[PDB]
Amino acid sequence: GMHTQEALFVRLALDAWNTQSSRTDKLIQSLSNEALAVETAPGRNSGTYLLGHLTAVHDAMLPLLELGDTLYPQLAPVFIQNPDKSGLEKPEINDLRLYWSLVQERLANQFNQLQPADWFNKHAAISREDFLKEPHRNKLSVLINRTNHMAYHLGQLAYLKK
Amino acid sequence: GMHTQEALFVRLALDAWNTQSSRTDKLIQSLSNEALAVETAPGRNSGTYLLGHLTAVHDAMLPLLELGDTLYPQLAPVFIQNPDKSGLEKPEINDLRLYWSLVQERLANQFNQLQPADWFNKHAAISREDFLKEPHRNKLSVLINRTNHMAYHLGQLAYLKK
Ligand SMILES: [Cl-]
Ligand SMILES: [Cl-]
Ligand SMILES: [Cl-]
Numbered sequence: 001g002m003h004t005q006e007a008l009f010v011r012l013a014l015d016a017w018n019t020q021s022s023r024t025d026k027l028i029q030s031l032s033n034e035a036l037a038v039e040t041a042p043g044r045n046s047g048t049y050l051l052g053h054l055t056a057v058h059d060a061m062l063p064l065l066e067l068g069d070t071l072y073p074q075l076a077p078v079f080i081q082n083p084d085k086s087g088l089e090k091p092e093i094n095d096l097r098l099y100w101s102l103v104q105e106r107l108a109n110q111f112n113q114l115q116p117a118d119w120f121n122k123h124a125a126i127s128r129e130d131f132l133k134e135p136h137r138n139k140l141s142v143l144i145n146r147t148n149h150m151a152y153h154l155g156q157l158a159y160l161k162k
Numbered sequence: 163g164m165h166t167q168e169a170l171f172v173r174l175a176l177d178a179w180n181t182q183s184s185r186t187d188k189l190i191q192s193l194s195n196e197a198l199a200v201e202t203a204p205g206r207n208s209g210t211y212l213l214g215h216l217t218a219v220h221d222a223m224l225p226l227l228e229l230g231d232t233l234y235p236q237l238a239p240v241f242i243q244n245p246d247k248s249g250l251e252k253p254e255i256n257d258l259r260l261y262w263s264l265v266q267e268r269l270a271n272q273f274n275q276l277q278p279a280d281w282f283n284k285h286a287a288i289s290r291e292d293f294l295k296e297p298h299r300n301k302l303s304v305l306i307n308r309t310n311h312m313a314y315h316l317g318q319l320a321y322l323k324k
């Protein structure tokens with residue numbers, strides 16, 4: 001019944017995250033460093049930047065979902081707070097590939113241990129008071145939102161496959 | 163309790179559809195016909211093609227979700243079954259803009275009348291027998307999937323804004 005239904009909608013949301021994650025991971029693995037460094041389209045973000053961006057955004061989900069601290073806080077100034085052509089030094093690409101992999105794996109670990117119910121609790125960026133009015137502003141809503149963020153950028157990364 | 167929880171996860175899924183739909187619609191409205199006709203990136207699909215593609219894919223959700231027949235079946239051969247540079251004649255762009263708008267509005271109408279429970283029934287492309295094993299293969303799973311499909315293509319349409 002109701003406990004089972006809650007488990008089914010967590011499955012749906014997690015299956016979409018996992019599908020986008022698989023596609024993103026496989027795409028990144030398929031590209032050489034030289035191919036990743038190219039702009040996704042003229043004047044637009046490089047694959048390297050999008051990799052770092054996705055990594056930083058996913059890492060930030062850890063504290064937002066009360067699943068632990070970020071692993072790599074120094075990525076956020078480079079890949080969230082500043083644009084690609086900022087002139088700020090980036091990590092080497094193979095280090096970014098590893099950070100991506102370790103953030104994704106930590107999230108998978110943590111997600112796989114959460115009970116369906118925990119997903120319906122508030123995320124860290126909303127007050128208890130505001131969550132009462134809008135209980136849809138929960139941890140699952142973050143998962144859903146970031147899954148679409150990833151899909152959006154995956155459409156751009158797709159243009160690096162020549 | 164459980165009826166309320168079911169309503170909250172429909173809200174979450176529909177809010178994501180509506181957010182992507184808003185962003186897509188506003189982007190399309192912001193582009194001139196000449197700007198939409200340009201390739202999203204060198205050698206890649208035009209905005210026109212992606213508009214027709216999104217329209218056809220969304221129209222196909224009507225029968226899949228048992229919400230009525232497709233409005234514009236002739237779009238599917240042009241924008242789903244064949245690629246952009248097929249040489250097949252396309253509708254005029256302003257006709258495509260209208261088809262997009264009418265499909266989106268029909269879907270909104272229909273979605274706004276469905277009860278949360280109806281979203282947890284099977285979609286038209288799975289058997290009752292197979293749905294018993296995998297009840298997550300429901301109407302909501304289609305909504306979620308097509309929301310990420312739209313986000314993916316929205317990332318590409320974004321590159322038409324010069
Ligand atoms: Cl995808
Ligand atoms: Cl490339
Ligand atoms: Cl978006």
Ligand SMILES: [Cl-]
Binds near residue numbers: 198200324
């Ligand atoms: Cl353009």
